[PDB]
């Protein structure tokens, strides 16, 4: 990863064993739960395309998922080549070439090239671009791995409202690979799947009530 | 390893106990699964030939694989000597058998630098590729979806074995075109054949969910 030394210079650092083992264990235990994507985004901080490829390569299982991820990366790389093409020709003696879809994914670029692109002024965040593609693929894989549907999440007869909400927004997070899920249909579905008593209470509470008030009403 | 210090100088650092324990535990747990080679490549970042020899030598078991690896290193060193007949490094100097740490540091930090560590790691990774391909427990032809097995697991084993076998991308693609679909259990196989040609992995896994 590109980290700043005390001198104020942006330098390259070998990926740490603690980070490697961290990512590996996250993929082992959490499988493809939504929270794995934030963790990834945090463990790949300041990472180069090489370091990202290291994190992804060290994954031993879920190889099918890794194939879907590779397909997605190729798609985003092609879209980069379409929207961001590089002029075939000479390069100024003092400048550096432009990255292709293969150069951002670290498959046709050397570590020194990636360092130059990431430390140039203005910088070219190839690591953040590649990380965004990887996070798109991971989003797709998480969405696919969703065990159940939000439609099948209903409050038990003698189940607390809090647990029902937990499984509700958990399952919805899994099915949408996101936590911003404040839709009218989503809310109406939350209130509808509730048990009859808490349903009448919530309906009586009125429209636009906060989740805090809703959970306070069905204590 | 050779690492850059905050003063901008390239200095020598001692290999860490964290890294040593890491590599040891990886070889212990994962044996020679493909993922072992990336991890190695990641723990040897900036390594000298002496550090690579340290990593390989701390391995307690798998002495057959280590002797094979020795042979491969000898082959690559002989080829290096043929190609390439302060001192200049020979095949034995890159593998750290006849060179001293200070000489390796000299070559690696020289200007222009002579990456002996990266060359040796290249040969080592080649030998490891051969060992992994040889230690694959099952062939891709015998990877067939069990009757009561989830399709996701079947493709996980399919592409795990396909990664262990290490073929060209054309052979891998060609394998997943026909061999992937044919080896599925009757249900998911009928569904897949009902989907159509040129379906993505995402679509196949979706249909058989």
């Amino acid at each position: 990863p590109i980290v700043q030394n005390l001198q104020g210079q942006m330098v390259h650092q070998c990926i740490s064993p603690r980070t490697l083992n961290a990512w590996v264990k996250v993929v082992e235990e959490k499988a493809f739960s939504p929270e794995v994507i934030p963790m990834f985004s945090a463990l790949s901080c300041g990472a180069t395309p090489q370091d990202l490829n290291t994190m992804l390569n060290t994954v031993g299982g879920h190889q099918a998922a890794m194939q879907m991820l590779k397909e997605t990366i190729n798609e985003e790389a092609a879209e980069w080549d379409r929207l961001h093409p590089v002029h075939a020709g000479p390069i100024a003696p003092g400048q550096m070439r432009e990255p292709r879809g293969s150069d951002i994914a670290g498959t046709t670029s050397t570590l020194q090239e990636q360092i130059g692109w990431m430390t140039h002024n203005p910088p070219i965040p190839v690591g953040e671009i590649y990380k965004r593609w990887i996070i798109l693929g991971l989003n797709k894989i998480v969405r696919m791995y969703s065990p159940t549907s939000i439609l099948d999440i209903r409050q038990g007869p003698k189940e607390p409202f809090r647990d029902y909400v937990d499984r509700f927004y958990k399952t919805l997070r899994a099915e949408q690979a996101s936590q911003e899920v404040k839709n009218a249909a989503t809310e109406t579905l939350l209130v509808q799947n509730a048990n009859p008593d808490c349903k009448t209470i919530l309906k009586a509470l009125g429209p636009g009530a906060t989740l805090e008030e809703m959970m306070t009403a069905c204590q | 390893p050779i690492v850059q210090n905050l003063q901008g100088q390239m200095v020598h650092q001692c290999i860490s106990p964290r890294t040593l324990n890491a590599w040891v535990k990886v070889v212990e747990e994962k044996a020679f699964s493909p993922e072992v080679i990336p991890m190695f490549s990641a723990l040897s970042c900036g390594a000298t030939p002496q550090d690579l020899n340290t990593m390989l030598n701390t391995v307690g078991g798998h002495q057959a694989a280590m002797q094979m690896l020795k042979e491969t290193i000898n082959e690559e060193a002989a080829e290096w000597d043929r190609l390439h007949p302060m001192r200049e490094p020979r095949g034995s100097d890159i593998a750290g058998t006849t060179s001293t740490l200070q000489e390796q540091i000299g070559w690696m930090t020289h200007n222009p630098p002579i990456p002996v560590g990266e060359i040796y790691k290249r040969w080592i990774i080649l030998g490891l590729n051969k060992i992994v391909r040889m230690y694959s427990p099952t062939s891709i032809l015998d990877i067939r979806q069990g009757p009561k097995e989830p399709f996701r697991d079947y493709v996980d084993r399919f592409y795990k074995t396909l990664r262990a076998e290490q073929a060209s991308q054309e052979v891998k693609n060609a394998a997943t075109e026909t061999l992937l679909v044919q080896n599925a259990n009757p249900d998911c196989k009928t569904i897949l054949k009902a989907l159509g040609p040129g379906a993505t992995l995402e679509e196949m896994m979706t249909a058989c969910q």
Binding site: N53, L56, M66, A105 | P34, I125, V132, R133, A164, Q166
Partner: peptide, 10 residues
């Protein structure tokens, strides 16, 4: 010769 196990990158 083998092709490698580095699914991503080179």
């Amino acid at each position: 010769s083998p092709s490698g196990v580095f699914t991503f990158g080179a």
